[PDB]
Amino acid sequence: KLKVVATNSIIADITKNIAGDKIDLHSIVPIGQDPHEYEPLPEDVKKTSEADLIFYNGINLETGGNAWFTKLVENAKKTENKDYFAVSDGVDVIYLEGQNEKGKEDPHAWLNLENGIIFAKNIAKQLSAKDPNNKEFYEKNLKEYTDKLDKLDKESKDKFNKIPAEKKLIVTSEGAFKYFSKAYGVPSAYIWEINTEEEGTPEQIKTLVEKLRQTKVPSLFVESSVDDRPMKTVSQDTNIPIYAQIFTNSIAEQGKEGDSYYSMMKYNLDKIAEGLAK
């Protein structure tokens, strides 16, 4: 079978929904770990060296900081846009501090569903190019999968559009929800910016408290993958409850709620639409 490597569980899950058992699939970053600044293990090196097709997020997720993915493909003698492909190719990129420069792309594109669809379309295209025998199969799965994502996307947009606008603010610890904000029409507020060295300092917490005091936002949220003590402090200091934990950069373990890209997103969308309507 085609040997495929995905850098993280979101990409791997989307890939599974396109390819089913037609491929040999290895995922590098395990469920619940952070795909930024990961350390590949020997099995990852072996699988990537053997791979026919390699998918990564791109837009600086795996190539910033320690640039682990770059090191991995260079050692594996794999070539950009021949062996390995950024599944974010084609997304409408957001830049940190709104400054369009290479390296300032915000990586968190999958947190709106239109980009999950783009991810899937890129995955299907490259599976089909490397394994034409199964092209019809990949394309059928692509349509089914992207239909599923599109329905959820439209339903969620309809819900957000109904919420009184004074309540519409997505508050999280890290500013990782800017693509979500763009797509669903819900402005972002947060304790610390992407790629900040110190997470959850007194300066940062105070800043967010002072902003939220002037708002009517009814719920805050917290990422399952961050230390929740800064947001708990913000919650206490503003008297705004934390409604839910939400997913950011990983699906959940198999069998749990959110154990696929689709169900991860449905959980997020469901909890945030619920929480902001309070």
Author numbering: 32 to 309
Provide the publication's sentences verbatim:
We further analysed the metal-binding site coordination geometry by use of an Asp280 variant isoform (PsaA-D280N), as it would be incapable of facilitating the trigonal-bipyramidal coordination observed in wild-type PsaA8. The structure of PsaA-D280N bound to Cd2+, refined to 1.7 Å resolution, revealed a partially solvated Cd ion loosely interacting with residue Glu205. The C-terminal lobe of PsaA showed minor movement (~1.0° relative to the open, metal-free conformation), but the inability of Cd2+ to ligate to residue Asp280 prevented further conformational changes.
Similar to other ABC permeases, the SBP PsaA defines the specificity of the uptake pathway. However, our recent studies showed that the functional specificity of the Psa permease in Mn2+ acquisition arose not from the specificity of Mn2+ binding by PsaA, but instead resulted from the concerted action of protein metal ion coordination chemistry and structural rearrangements that prevented release of other divalent transition metal ions, such as Zn2+, into the permease, despite their ability to bind to PsaA8. PsaA uses a ‘spring-hammer’-like mechanism for metal ion binding, in which the dynamics of the metal ion-loaded protein are dictated by a combination of metal ion geometry and the distortion of a helix linking the N- and C-terminal lobes of the protein.
